[PDB]
RNA sequence: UGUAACGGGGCUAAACCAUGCACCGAAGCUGCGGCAGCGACGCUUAUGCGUUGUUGGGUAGGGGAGCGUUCUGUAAGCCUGCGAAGGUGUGCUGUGAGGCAUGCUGGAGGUAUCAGAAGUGCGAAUGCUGACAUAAGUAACGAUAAAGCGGGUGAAAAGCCC
RNA sequence: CCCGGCGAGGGGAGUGAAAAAGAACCUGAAACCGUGUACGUACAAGCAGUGGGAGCACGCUUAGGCGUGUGACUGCGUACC
């Protein structure tokens, strides 16, 4: 802290309490005995665990009947109107999208929507799954998963 | 000096009992002008016992 | 993250003072005092609930011992005659009789003397 | 329930008299304090005064056992310099006999307002006459 | 009736002022002015000026009726205390308080 | 725009804190130094 | 310093000895009710129990189970301008830190649940900051060279002008 | 407009959803200070309380009690770290 290392006043011969500095925490304007530093909060996760956990939840999705599988799934052109219009026929609101390969013609119209996220197999994370009440996959896309774990 | 410990508010409230004011509770009326004035003291206009003096 | 305590301290203090309502002077106002006044008040309670049962049972006896003598006998011997006559009545109800109903108590005393004879 | 307790309004007091001639001092006052305190009645409430008015008479005729007449002492202090005064039982009778009975009872009674109260009940005289007849003294002896 | 009046940020100690107030409570109006006038304090002039206004603050703003009138609620509550120094020996200063007293007057027929 | 004078009470404040801490701190043993004579007698080193 | 070497009254027994029967008197024991810990029991079978007994003062200290504030995700969800938070009381409630509704204000935010990270819970530390009591309307108004009076001003004059 | 010293401060009127938004101007707590009302207090000795406990005054009600405030008198009891 900005300040001066001088004793704020004399050691003895006074009615106040012994003080060696103005920068101490019991004092106003400067303090914080223990101060934080931008330390890294990340954790390590054993591979097989991460690879072993995804096995579970997927199994847990089927038993919830939340997971869904379909054949080739894409929009014709980049329009949220068309995209959502395809889900409203499927009775879907909050959903996830995962496919083995992305068509840039799609990911545009999926952007603007608050209730949707689109992903590629290499880009999935556990939390995204649990979040959305429904999930989809492409049999192709599925092949990359079971092939991934092995 | 050095009060060893502090008195109450009730205490000093008693100390200030006799400190209260006493009202005059008496006045007069001029023998002529009918003005209000103290006993033995002149009226603002100067009339004392019906007599005019100062005329200021 | 940082925390500000301006509030739940009021809660504590306000609570306490409420329990300190009625006490004299600084004890009903400041927290730094009332805190040790209430904590002391409680341990009179824990102390008092014990001994009140002493206070009444030394009262109830005093009630009785008079009326006995008023009937011409002393507390001690009066009891023992009952314990020989097999009467379990408590001292509470007994004393209550001597205040309201003199008859039973009077009519009762002859019992002891009878058996105690 | 809540056990009964006496109330000043509902109190019923009474008058009594004693002739102290031939009596033993200590053994007399204890009974006098028993009455005034109310422990002889059924309704006794320790924070109330249920005692009955008492009137002693002919206190100077009182007697004591042994040599205490020329021995027993009274002491009182004036709040001055440390100065102390003492008076024998003999003296006190020849001067203020009413004090004697009026003292011994006090030491046998509680301190505080109440003990001062029931003390107001008592009336002593060194003579055989009293002017309190109007309240009547239904007689008592012991 | 109502039509109160008040003086605020006066320079005086409520203690002092509080002596005059006791001399008038529940009293008839006219007496006070006669009492205050021949009373001697720095406050009597001060407080009187207020009381003079409450009345005048009435008849113009409400039903008047002075000859039957009374002082019901008067009180004093301290105001700010200004901070000043009077120095002393050895170099020590001292914080002295210029104390101020708000005033309130309630004058009514009842 | 419609401000109340200027209240300089804070001036006498900062002067009081400054004045009070100055002496009270650096005055050192002046009360005691003076007391020192007293200090040489009131002590009773035995 | 003042009875003063029975606690005091007061006591020739209301003292000492011997003998005996009652009675009083603790939070001790028992009686009624309730909570929790421990062990065996056979069912149960992370559980009802049946019980059966037993335990439950406690500093330094060790172990176990917990209340509640902020922030984050769950939450573009829930409540809310027919009133949040905050403040101020009442009534209920829990074994405890505490929890719930509501009366008055205030005028816009709070957040269920479940997990996570804490600058996380105050009476002190001749503690720091600011505000306010005290002694107290007491001491003091700063050289003992000295003021008095009439007119004027003005709301007011001893202290301003003549 | 009035008081007020052709002041301060204030009260009316009025604006404004709200002057419990008036410049010191969102909220407005505590210590501290006061006014107001019920009860108690001038024969009464001591951590100031608790336990009991009248009487008094209230709000309920039911009709007999229940509650709130005070607290006369009494046993016990020498604060915190």
UniProtKB/Swiss-Prot annotation, chain A:
Residues 1-20 are annotated as: Disordered. Changing residue 116 to D: Does not regulate the S10 operon in vivo. GO terms for molecular function: DNA binding; endoribonuclease inhibitor activity; mRNA 5'-UTR binding; RNA-binding transcription regulator activity; rRNA binding; structural constituent of ribosome; translation repressor activity. Keywords: Antibiotic resistance, Repressor, Ribonucleoprotein, Ribosomal protein, RNA-binding, rRNA-binding, Transcription, Transcription regulation, Transcription termination, Translation regulation. GO terms for cellular component: cytoplasm; cytosol; cytosolic large ribosomal subunit; large ribosomal subunit. It comes from the Bacteria. Disulfide bonds: none annotated. GO terms for biological process: cytoplasmic translation; DNA-templated transcription termination; negative regulation of cytoplasmic translation; negative regulation of DNA-templated transcription; negative regulation of translation; response to antibiotic; ribosome assembly; transcriptional attenuation. The keyword Nucleotide-binding does not apply. Belongs to the universal ribosomal protein uL4 family. Part of the 50S ribosomal subunit. In TnaC-stalled ribosomes forms part of the binding pocket for L-Trp with the leader peptide and uL22. This is Large ribosomal subunit protein uL4.
UniProtKB/Swiss-Prot annotation, chain D:
Keywords: Ribonucleoprotein, Ribosomal protein. Gene3D superfamilies: Ribosomal protein L13. SUPFAM superfamilies: Ribosomal protein L13. One of its GO terms (biological process) is cytoplasmic translation. It comes from the Bacteria. One of its GO terms (molecular function) is zinc ion binding. One of its GO terms (cellular component) is cytosol. Belongs to the universal ribosomal protein uL13 family. PANTHER family: LARGE RIBOSOMAL SUBUNIT PROTEIN UL13M, RIBOSOMAL PROTEIN L13. Part of the 50S ribosomal subunit. This protein is one of the early assembly proteins of the 50S ribosomal subunit, although it is not seen to bind rRNA by itself. It is important during the early stages of 50S assembly. This is Large ribosomal subunit protein uL13.
UniProtKB/Swiss-Prot annotation, chain E:
It holds the Pfam family Ribosomal_L22. CDD domains: Ribosomal_L22. Keywords: Antibiotic resistance, Ribonucleoprotein, Ribosomal protein, RNA-binding, rRNA-binding. One of its GO terms (molecular function) is large ribosomal subunit rRNA binding. One of its GO terms (cellular component) is cytosolic large ribosomal subunit. Changing residue 8 to C: In strain: SK1048; decreases translational rate, tRNA binding and subunit association at 44 degrees Celsius; does not alter 23S rRNA or uL4 interactions; not erythromycin resistant. The wild-type allele (erythromycin sensitive) is dominant over the resistant allele, and is also dominant over the temperature-sensitive allele at both low and high temperatures. Belongs to the universal ribosomal protein uL22 family. This is Large ribosomal subunit protein uL22.
Swiss-Prot record, chain F:
GO terms for molecular function: ATP binding; DNA binding; DNA topoisomerase type II (double strand cut, ATP-hydrolyzing) activity. It comes from the Viruses. Keywords: ATP-binding, DNA-binding, Isomerase, Nucleotide-binding, Topoisomerase. Signal peptide: none annotated. GO terms for cellular component: DNA topoisomerase type II (double strand cut, ATP-hydrolyzing) complex; protein-containing complex. GO terms for biological process: DNA topological change; sister chromatid segregation. Small subunit of the DNA topoisomerase that untwists superhelical DNA. Controls topological states of double-stranded DNA by transient breakage and subsequent rejoining of DNA strands. There is a 50-nucleotide untranslated region in the coding sequence of gene 60. The ribosome apparently skips this region while reading the mRNA. Part of the DNA topoisomerase complex made of gp39, gp52 and gp60. This is DNA topoisomerase small subunit. It comes from Enterobacteria phage T4. The gene is 60. The chain holds residues 1 to 46 of 160 of the full protein.
